[PDB]
């Protein structure tokens, strides 16, 4: 467990990609006319949600939810209703796609006007369950990453950039 962390994706770059995601999300929803709510998955999405929602130029609500990353259970459900609203699930990263997949199903049952997912990172190679992912900040190989909500031994979660854990020998 002896190691070091080096910057992989500088915060300045993360900020740029998010602003763009924001324009994209805004453009995609600005004319819906229905209520919108960004749904972040805890703990991972807190930082990403913070920045992202500020880049979304349409009036919207911000709610969080926390699932158990065998059965995907709900430790903390949404505080507000989503029925008839536009819901954009926000996660820091998708790899296997299991939790995201199940969470999308659960929310689907509440009959929202629509459902989409926006992740800061995407690890295509690790996918195990195909699930739609409308907005992605970065596509990366299966690297040992941390920061921006992603931890390693309850650490680096507060880093302003995405770094890679170099596992010293």
């Amino acid at each position: 467990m002896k190691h070091t962390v080096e910057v992989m994706i500088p915060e300045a770059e993360i900020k740029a990609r998010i602003a763009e995601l924001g324009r994209q999300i805004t453009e995609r929803y600005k004319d819906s006319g229905s209520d919108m709510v960004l749904v972040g998955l805890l703990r991972g999405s807190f930082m990403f949600m913070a920045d992202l929602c500020r880049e979304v130029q349409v009036s919207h609500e911000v709610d969080f939810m926390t699932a158990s990353s065998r059965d995907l259970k709900i430790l903390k459900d949404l505080d507000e209703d989503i029925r008839g609203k536009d819901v954009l699930i926000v996660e820091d990263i998708i790899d296997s796609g299991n939790t995201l997949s199940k969470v999308r199903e659960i929310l689907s049952l509440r009959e929202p006007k629509s459902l989409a997912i926006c992740t800061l990172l995407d690890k295509p190679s690790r996918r195990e369950v195909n699930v739609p992912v409308e907005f992605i900040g970065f596509s990366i190989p299966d690297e040992f990453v941390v920061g921006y909500g992603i931890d390693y031994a309850q650490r680096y979660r507060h880093l302003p950039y995405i770094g890679k854990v170099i596992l010293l020998d």
Copy 2:
């Protein structure tokens, strides 16, 4: 809010009906062979659960879940995994069928081997949604019942019998 409570279903009557329900549920699942779990919906069904599981002659586990009743949110999810298991949802009362209908959808997503519902009381005259109910203790008229876990303004759950509030008397 001034009111009276009259007996609707005496304790002995309930005790007998539950023994029967027990035999029936037992007969149904005795030859399944996969794990079985009864899921009571807090708060109202804790008493019915306590008595019912004691009449179920097949080895099972007991878990609980608490749900809201606009969107149906999970205030307390199961501690157990139900995937590939016979699941018997234990409810105290079904009238409109909204909440149960949804709770059932949510568990269905976890892919249990089988999914059924067992309710103590049933007000068919109140049904708004078609929902499969495999076991019913009593089909009753549209009375405001209390006791045996059920309440009236956080009151009467401890009554050993199902009673009906009269009011203005």
Copy 3:
């Protein structure tokens, strides 16, 4: 893990002790005049709570709560308030006394009129944290018990009696 279960405390005896606990609890509170609420710890106390509350002859509420049996956390808090009320925590068994001890502290902060604990079983020898326990159904040595809410490998939780797990070789 190969074993068998033999009856240690017959349900008929459990029922008798509970009726007596009920008289004792009733006598102790009947003149308070304040609101009363029995607080059961999930999953363990569901069955005991069911029977016990029926033996308590004073008007009271029934709420449940579930803690994490290193830090004692609250997975599901009470649905109702206890401030200014008489609160009787109900558990199936106390051994180390850790969870019970912490739960009593947490509820204490809400300033209830009073706080007491009632357990069906007590394992004095295993105590690690001294905490008051006003009502006990049975005092037993450190036996491998199951039933009446107490499980073993998600099993025997529904047994109507307290049995001892004979660990066959």
Copy 4:
């Protein structure tokens, strides 16, 4: 309910104040040596948390907790253990001091190495309970503020600045 929103604290002003708070908190805990954890109180403080932890130059973990505000109930407890750790409760706003006062009592029970509070906004003119607040971003007049995580009828949390609702205008 007809209203207007005016800027009260511009985004740049907040950004600068947080950098300062960051230096201060860093200076305070840099030589402690035990694990440290910032606990944000959902929902209102997710944004302040996101920005604050990035200015804290000491290795820490980030966790969240959601509480009610008559009795103070835990709707979502921490995922981490705080025993023997420096704990920095991260709040968005403190006015009466009731909720924080209680949340602090609850965590205090888990025996952390140290326990402090850091709030972005403060309405001293609204204080009803004496509660220790170690770090404050801004002491403000009694205005109904929104933005930067804070809301008005589930609205405005995404604003990058603290604004004040005007109403009937």
